[PDB]
Design a protein around this nucleic acid. Structure first.
Lengths: 333, 231, 429, 294
DNA sequence: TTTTTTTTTTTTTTTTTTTTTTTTTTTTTTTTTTTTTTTTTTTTT
DNA sequence: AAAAAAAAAAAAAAAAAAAAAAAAAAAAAAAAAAAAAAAAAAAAA
């Protein structure tokens, strides 16, 4: 099989971000390599309950061998019933002037004592990043080199993989994304309007194939059809980092069936685009179906509940969806 | 230059229940959390989505229109036979678009999400993602039942100030003044009542209502027409 | 020289493309040009197939074909595939091959949106597929599974914007449907081009609404003739109710004159169905208290029975009479001039500008027969529940004429509801 | 130990006002086993009453039916006992099943048989046995407090003609009480609407004698702030039997004529829920804000 | 230049799919039948 | 003429039948595919 889905997520909230101690000792004995806070483990459980709701479960999770990226997947792996594979090709980024040392983490033999039953020794790492640190030019080319070698091994070792998860560090999240999409450098905006890969703790990327009708790695093309998602986290975007006030509302996209006994539905793993939200009638796609719909406000006030989503193996977060669009079916020609 | 492609987004998303309360709640969490407290609270709102089965075997979700409390901490209208909502069987699927945009764009634009968007038309600050799919809904379309009031019928105030309040101090004096040997089951319960402060008429035997004064909560269809099925 | 037999699966699409190309260029269906492409078929077989295809696609299809055609025509001139001379001579072969060649290239693209909205308005043309027709019906329901499944699903919203149709333009579209209905009860058939009153409204919209009314079976189409469907009269005689109210202003008299005597009408047999359209309202008007004929009964110890226990004595035959305290339902109605628009403006009004009085009776009573069971109504959900019968331009002239004759009263936001003795529309004086 | 009894009952009533109501039950049903409380029978009566109040803050059919059968049995024939049963079954349609059940309608026939046995001093076929023996009735009237709840357990269960039996039996004895005349009118109309009955229009109007008798009783012999429910309920009736514009004049009377907000939220809701079907969607959202929003 | 053969196009026939109507099954209501008790009539002393 | 026994009716209770609504099956209509026939093109004499 050929991988249709790549997820990339940054690790949970670091213990050494906390305002007061005692800051915990790095369990591996290596410099940096700190564990998560309980608040970070909570963002990891949120991320897990988001992915768990998607019919597109991961087949496996590739973890950075740095301690905090594995402490991020220990609830995910045990909740989606998947193996975790160590991959040095998705470790942290450090520069050659970083002090007092460049951290590179210990092997399966140490990590399996802290994360028993989570990690599988079945996979050998695609590549190791430079132990003397990497320039931005080295770092970007190391990730550009990783992708074809990595996916070529995945589709030979694990030919049943159509969906995969990668859990890693801030530079390691953005640099992987920009190189998969095929940009010249990690500082480029995704579009002319200036958007970039959003990269707070537990922020989620999904990269999805353009669909035909085995395939080599070089002929493939993608879209980042879920940018740095935090809409499932309690606290939203936190401790974001990037290569260099706001208010929230919700609109329902209703798709009504004509006969009251007949129900109409949204296809698994389908895609949406919106255009002309500002206009008296926007345009929409759902899978390969197209639409246009009137602007509507309710009598009364729908609540719709993310915290009450289905499972398909503080103020409670709730949406007051008083405003809506009612999509008439509006196919192309 | 190749015309710019709109960001494609997944529709594999968390799938979401929804609740069309005929309550015109404000944007504030302070309005929302009490508008939920009316329909049996954050617990029963979730459980009423799990209730599968044919539409007449559904208990449905209870909506209490008067969360009003008297100073004793009673339900001020403990006589409230609630509104019933039931889970729609034929809910079409629907996707929710979160709009992220500059603070106070709402107050600047008629408090309309539509015109809030239309104000930022030329600008990089507008940010839309589809974020979840509603696949299931409850609608409150079964009426509140008949409702008595128990503030002028004396033993009804005895019940409210005792049962409704749970106040031991105003409950002991309902139950004491209950006969063991009911001396005269023929006669007006007023004969046991200390409290004459409400001028109850002599003919009132202070019968309470049943919990369903109506038996069927949708209208029973007595459109008046001559029954062709009466035979 | 691309030719088709109209029986070929592509030949039906070639016939569609060719009428769109000819009418969009020369403002007319050039049949003398189209028949050159279908030598294997007769003029009238081709007309019929074309008419049936415009009926099934309706308003939301025809303009989508014309808009894609003119957008493809603009793209073909800008890519030198078409000289303006090929447009002026109307060479259907070239224009059909060019349409075929454009679809052959778009078929190869997975159909993504541009971010730019005008690029989407250029490079899609769009057919609105009428599943939810906005005919607000829940058809002839009686069962509690029918009624609770319907009324859990049904929509509870208000439009924020004007509709995607300009409401100043829709104020001609609904007014077309009504001028048509208001002539289908007048006549078993009518001709679009010659005899329609609407023609100040653009003939294109007249024709598009004729296609939509045939799609919704409000008319049959026999070529140029729209044809009357008795389904409209049948829905008036099933949902209109005026004979019950008629005998109800008459049963008001039969109750009232007897009330002050005390010893009055006795209810001792099944009283008429209409008698319950009157007694229930007049008792709810606090005119009434009810006395008992004291039928002596064999109550005995050890006995616990109901169903025929002294038979009639558990509906012990009542005397129905004046309560001493009150009368509420007196002299409230008045000679309010009938709601009468332009010569077929509203379902009832006849060509002379007076009511078709039976259609008026049936339709006002139909609207009150909505509102008895539908108080606090907009003009809009009454337009959708009446979409098989009345537009919004009709429903205001009933609902305000019933507020002025006080059978209706209105809340905030022009919700209509009836105050008591509502059935008595047709009172004796 | 009256001090400890007071502390147990007050503590249970306090616990039941908040979360984990089951801890309140544990105190009272422990007190029903403790001889120090349960050998005083007024306190037996009080415990069974307290736990019945507490049950209505939680929500069930079976626990509530069990506590009620637990205190109509003791404290036999008794007006206040029978009346607290009928307040209790108000909130929750979970409560309707306790009255549609045959299991309780059998109980109320056997009680009516037992009262007749002690009224005429005979055996009665399938009576309950008497144990509360000061029951004295020299003018030999019925017990209205029996007649009514036996009609209720026939009225719930859709025995509408069988319910009208015992409310015509209570009409003979206490002619102008409120709930007798409301429930009786309720039985005649709920009966009437069954698929096929002979005398169907006749069978609705007997509903109106006993509803409007209850209204003329309430409107002319009670305080304004409780005439409001005479307007609300007669409104509600017309809505139940689907004569809804007659329900609306009466719902509006709750909104316009009175100060006390409580019934305006019901009259408003049962207006809104019509006004959705009717589709004055503007007015519905407006009333909803004016009365129901916060 | 003419005749024969092969290929392509058009028309007709057959089969499958969708829509509509009828029949069967289940549920609710109403009427009738069965059983028990009381009253009236007939037979016997 | 009186008293006792038996039969019938009535009130009541319980069960069965009748009526309506819902679901499934059969029939009818429409669309698609296959087969046959005719026309056109190519090759051979």
């Amino acid at each position: 099989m050929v991988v249709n889905t790549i997820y990339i997520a940054r690790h949970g909230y670091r213990s050494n971000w906390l305002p007061e101690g005692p800051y915990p000792d790095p369990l591996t004995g290596i410099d940096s390599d700190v564990p998560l806070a309980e608040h970070g483990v909570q963002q990891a459980k949120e991320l897990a309950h988001y992915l768990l709701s998607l019919d597109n479960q991961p087949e496996a999770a590739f973890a950075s061998p740095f301690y905090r990226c594995l402490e991020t997947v220990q609830p995910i792996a045990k909740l989606l019933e998947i193996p975790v594979y160590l991959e040095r090709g998705i470790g942290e980024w450090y520069r050659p002037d970083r002090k007092p040392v460049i951290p590179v983490p210990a092997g399966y033999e140490i990590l399996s004592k802290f994360f028993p039953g989570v990690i599988s020794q079945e996979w050998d790492s695609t590549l190791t990043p430079n132990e003397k640190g990497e320039t931005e030019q080295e770092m970007y080319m190391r990730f550009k080199k990783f992708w074809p070698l990595f996916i070529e091994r995945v589709e030979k070792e694990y030919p049943n993989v159509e969906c995969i998860l990668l859990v890693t560090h801030a530079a390691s999240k953005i640099a992987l994304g920009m190189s998969l999409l095929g940009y010249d450098n990690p500082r480029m905006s995704l579009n002319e309007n200036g958007d970039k890969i959003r990269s707070g703790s537990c922020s989620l990327d999904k990269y999805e194939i353009l669909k035909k009708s085995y395939i080599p790695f070089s002929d493939r093309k993608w879209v980042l059809t879920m940018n740095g998602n935090t809409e499932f986290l309690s606290s939203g975007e936190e401790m974001n980092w990037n290569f260099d006030e706001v208010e929230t509302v919700y609109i329902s996209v209703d798709i009504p069936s004509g006969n009251y006994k007949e129900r109409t539905e949204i296809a698994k793993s389908a895609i949406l685009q919106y255009s002309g939200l500002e206009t008296d009638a926007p345009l929409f796609r759902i899978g390969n179906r197209l639409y246009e719909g009137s602007w509507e406000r309710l009598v009364g006030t729908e609540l719709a509940f993310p915290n009450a989503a289905h499972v398909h193996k503080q103020s409670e977060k709730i949406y007051r969806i008083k405003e809506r669009i009612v999509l008439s079916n509006v196919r192309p020609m | 230059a190749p015309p710019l492609i709109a960001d494609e987004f997944t529709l594999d998303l968390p799938r979401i229940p929804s609740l069309e309360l005929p309550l015109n709640v404000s944007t504030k969490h302070s309005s929302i959390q009490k508008a939920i407290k009316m329909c049996g609270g954050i617990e029963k709102v979730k459980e009423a989505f799990k209730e599968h089965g044919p539409i007449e075997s559904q208990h449905g979700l209870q909506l209490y229109l008067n969360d009003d409390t008297d100073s004793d901490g009673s339900k001020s209208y403990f006589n409230e036979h609630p509104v019933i909502g039931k889970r729609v069987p034929f809910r079409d699927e629907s996707v929710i678009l979160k709009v992220t945009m500059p603070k106070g764009t709402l107050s600047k634009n008629n408090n309309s999400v539509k015109d809030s968007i239309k104000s930022l038309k030329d600008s990089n600050k507008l940010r839309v993602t589809p974020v979840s799919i509603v696949d299931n809904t409850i609608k409150f379309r079964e009426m509140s039942d008949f409702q008595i009031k128990l503030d002028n019928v004396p033993s009804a105030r005895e019940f409210k100030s005792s049962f409704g309040s749970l106040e031991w101090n105003n409950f002991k004096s309902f139950v004491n003044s209950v006969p063991d040997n009911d001396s005269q089951p023929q006669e007006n319960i007023g004969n046991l009542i200390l409290d004459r402060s409400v001028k109850i008429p002599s003919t009132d035997f202070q019968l309470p209502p049943p919990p369903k004064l109506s038996m069927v909560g949708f209208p029973l269809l007595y459109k008046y027409k001559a029954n062709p099925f009466a035979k | 020289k691309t030719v088709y037999h109209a029986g070929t699966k592509d030949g039906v699409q070639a016939l569609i493309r060719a009428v769109v190309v000819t009418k969009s260029i020369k403002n007319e269906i050039m049949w003398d040009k189209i028949t050159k492409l279908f030598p294997n078929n007769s003029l009238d077989n081709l007309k019929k197939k074309w008419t049936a295809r415009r009926v099934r696609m309706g308003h939301s299809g025809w303009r989508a074909y014309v808009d894609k055609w003119k957008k493809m025509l603009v793209l073909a001139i800008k890519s030198e595939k078409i000289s303006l001379r090929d447009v002026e001579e109307l060479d259907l072969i070239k224009l059909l091959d060019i349409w075929t060649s454009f679809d052959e290239k778009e078929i190869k693209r997975p159909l993504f949106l541009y971010k730019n909205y005008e690029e989407n308005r250029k490079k899609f043309t769009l057919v609105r597929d009428d599943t939810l027709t906005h005919s607000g019906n829940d058809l002839a329901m009686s069962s509690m599974i029918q009624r609770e499944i319907s009324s859990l699903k049904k929509t509870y919203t208000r439009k924020i914007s004007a509709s995607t149709k300009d409401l100043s333009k829709s104020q001609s579209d609904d007014y077309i449907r009504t001028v048509i209905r208001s002539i289908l009860i007048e006549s078993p058939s009518t001709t679009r081009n010659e005899i329609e009153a609407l023609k100040n409204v653009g003939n294109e919209s007249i024709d598009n609404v004729i296609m939509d009314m045939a799609k919704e079976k409000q008319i049959y189409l026999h070529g140029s003739k729209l044809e009357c469907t008795d389904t409209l009269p049948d829905i008036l005689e099933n949902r209109g109710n005026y004979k019950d109210f008629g005998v109800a202003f008459q049963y008001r008299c039969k109750v009232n004159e007897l009330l002050e005597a005390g010893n009055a009408i006795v209810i001792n047999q099944e009283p008429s169905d209409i008698s319950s359209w009157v007694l229930i309202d007049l008792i709810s008007g606090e005119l009434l208290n009810m006395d008992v004929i004291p039928m002596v009964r064999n109550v005995r110890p050890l006995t616990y029975t109901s169903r025929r226990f002294e038979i009639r004595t558990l509906t012990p035959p009542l005397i129905i009479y004046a309560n001493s305290q009150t009368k509420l339902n007196t002299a409230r109605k008045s000679a309010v001039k009938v709601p009468l628009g332009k010569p077929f403006s509203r379902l009832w009004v006849n060509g002379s500008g007076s009511i078709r009085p039976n259609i008026w009776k049936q339709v006002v009573t139909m609207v009150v027969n909505e509102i008895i069971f539908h108080p606090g109504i907009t003009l809009s959900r009454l337009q959708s529940r009446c979409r098989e019968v009345l537009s919004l331009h009709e429903i205001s002239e009933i609902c305000k004429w019933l507020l002025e004759r006080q059978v209706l009263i209105t809340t905030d936001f022009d919700g209509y509801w009836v105050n008591h003795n509502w059935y008595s529309i047709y009172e004796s004086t | 130990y009256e001090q400890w009894f007071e502390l147990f009952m007050e503590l249970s009533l306090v616990i039941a006002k908040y979360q984990s109501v089951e801890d309140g039950l544990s105190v009272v049903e422990t007190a029903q086993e403790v001889n120090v409380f349960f050998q005083d029978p007024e306190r037996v009566k009080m415990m069974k009453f307290v736990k019945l109040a507490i049950v209505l803050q939680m929500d069930d059919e079976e626990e509530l039916a069990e506590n009620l059968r637990g205190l109509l049995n003791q404290f036999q024939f008794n007006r206040k006992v029978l009346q607290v049963f009928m307040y209790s079954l108000c909130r929750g349609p979970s409560s309707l099943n306790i009255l549609s059940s045959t299991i309780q309608q059998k109980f109320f026939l056997r009680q009516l048989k037992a009262f007749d046995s002690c009224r005429y001093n005979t055996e009665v076929n399938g009576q309950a046995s008497i144990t509360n023996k000061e029951v004295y009735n020299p003018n030999k009237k019925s017990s209205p407090y029996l007649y009514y709840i036996y009609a209720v357990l026939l009225y719930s269960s859709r025995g509408f003609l069988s319910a009208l039996q015992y409310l015509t039996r209570l009409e003979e004895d206490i002619p102008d009480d409120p709930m007798v005349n409301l429930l009786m009118g309720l039985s005649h109309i709920h009966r009437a609407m069954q698929r096929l009955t002979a005398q169907r229009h006749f069978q609705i109007f007997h509903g109106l004698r006993y509803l409007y008798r209850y209204h003329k009783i309430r409107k002319s012999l009670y305080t304004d702030l409780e005439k409001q429910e005479a307007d609300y309920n007669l409104g509600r009736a017309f809505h139940l039997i689907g004569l809804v514009s007659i329900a609306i004049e009466y719902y509006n009377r709750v909104l316009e004529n009175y100060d006390d907000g409580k019934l305006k939220k019901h009259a408003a809701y049962n207006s809104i829920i019509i006004y959705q079907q009717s589709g004055n969607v503007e007015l519905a959202d407006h009333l909803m804000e004016k009365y129901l929003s916060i």
